[PDB]
Write a protein that binds this ligand. Sequence first.
Ligand SMILES: OC[C@H]1O[C@H](O[C@H]2[C@H](O)[C@@H](O)[C@@H](O)O[C@@H]2CO)[C@H](O)[C@@H](O)[C@@H]1O
Ligand SMILES: [N]
Lengths: 555, 16
Amino acid sequence: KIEEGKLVIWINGDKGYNGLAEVGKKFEKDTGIKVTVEHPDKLEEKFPQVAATGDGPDIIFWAHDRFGGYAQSGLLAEITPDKAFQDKLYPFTWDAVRYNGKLIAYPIAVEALSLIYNKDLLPNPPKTWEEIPALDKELKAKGKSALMFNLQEPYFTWPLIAADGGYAFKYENGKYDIKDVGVDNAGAKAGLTFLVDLIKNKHMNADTDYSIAEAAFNKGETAMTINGPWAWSNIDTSKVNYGVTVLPTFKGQPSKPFVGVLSAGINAASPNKELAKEFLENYLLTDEGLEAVNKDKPLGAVALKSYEEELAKDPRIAATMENAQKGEIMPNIPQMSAFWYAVRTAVINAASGRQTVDEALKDAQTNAAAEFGGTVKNYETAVQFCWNHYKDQMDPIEKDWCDWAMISRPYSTLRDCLEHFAERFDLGFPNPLAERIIFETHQIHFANCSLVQPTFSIQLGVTRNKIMTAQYECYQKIMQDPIQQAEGVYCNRTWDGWLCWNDVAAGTESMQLCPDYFQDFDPSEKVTKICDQDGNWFRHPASNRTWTNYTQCNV
Amino acid sequence: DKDNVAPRRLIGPWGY
Ligand SMILES: OC[C@H]1O[C@H](O[C@H]2[C@H](O)[C@@H](O)[C@@H](O)O[C@@H]2CO)[C@H](O)[C@@H](O)[C@@H]1O
Ligand SMILES: [N]
């Protein structure tokens, strides 16, 4: 339900929204139309949710990579820039917002990641990734670090993953082949192994996010970060003596950042489509409009020729375009959401040890491909995909279903597939459908095995083997007991991901010892799981997900 | 060897 006679605009919280609001004030002064600029969290996921019911903003700003998905879902208005207006913007910026031959958004500015370095801490930047460990050892002796950047968004790690041969989709002869994906190849593995090694060697921390890296760089604690033009405003405020420069090489090859074009789409459901056109063409995409936004947070290399020429001599913009030239323009195709979720999952899981680099990238490509081809659309279809993949591995090895050495990798991959898709569809793991699938493999594949414990006649790693062995024991016995094991109202037995819980009486704070899975777990400390007065397991209030309390294990 | 560090995401409210 979008209000006629005004404009609501969504733009990301790292962009110049105060400068965009100034453009909105000038619009209001000439037209009497109020412009509201908002920067909701997760706006790239929020926009398709709310727009799918005819709700949301009149105008949505994001890099062009998300817009094909929006277009395919019918969420975008057709845009109708005449030829004189198109001539005012660079052809390659229009190309970024052309999907199936149609312009689907207005391009605003070209963004690429650069290496940003503290010239006082580090007089010359490193030419290579390989030299960063030695540089960190020197800086650690002085209470500093070499490098901090966002490890939660795969955008920031992609330049290193792509350097030696990682790619999204094969683009040739003007078309993308979504059956030719470059996430699970020797180049992607080399890059992500280098990143995981930086973490294992304590040069970087898997938990570092955008805000932690920005604060550390802007306080002078770290010599280097990786960021885009929008970040320069807060560094200027900090008074750090900074350089913006070419990203370091990996295995002698350039880092290859995915190049974004900040773009503006008009909501299909907007009753304000002509107002939106007027605002974007005659107010924003002018020298005066882009200056107001750029003065708030730098845009990078703007799509408007006349203002790009004016800013072109900024060495920070020169370094931006040098990094852009070495990278690739992101595809705008509908498959980009599934692509980024899969690479997000691979980087987070590999950085935190939840998967090896090979498992992480192999699973990311397999599971993304399940979405790319339209099979998986929701958790029910995801679970059928995970089950079918698992059955295909299990059917040829039937004589060995009671051999842990033969079934432990398939069994582990089934759990990883169920967890990948649970998070993809904003479910907890475990969840009722996932529990039912794991119960089914115990009924179909393991029912004739003589033991509760796995028996045996590149195995899983030490920690993953302990976790999966424990899971297998849980489903062999506690999960299969035919009758209720706690009198009266009770919370149902569950495998929580790390530990097995039996049926527990309503109104009990159940306790077990911390598992021996991690070197930082104290095996004499306690895990708690609360069963409420209605026989429902406790849900953490921040998440509303069913939640076991492991917080005492690593204090 | 055994993993050095329990994943913080899995201890937090969106984890196990
Ligand atoms: O991390 C995946 C994410 O990467 C890109 O998002 C960038 C965005 O382009 C920049 O303007 C800036 O805001 O940083 C974001 C990363 O946090 C893709 O545009 C996006 O679709 C993708 O999910
Ligand atoms: N948890």
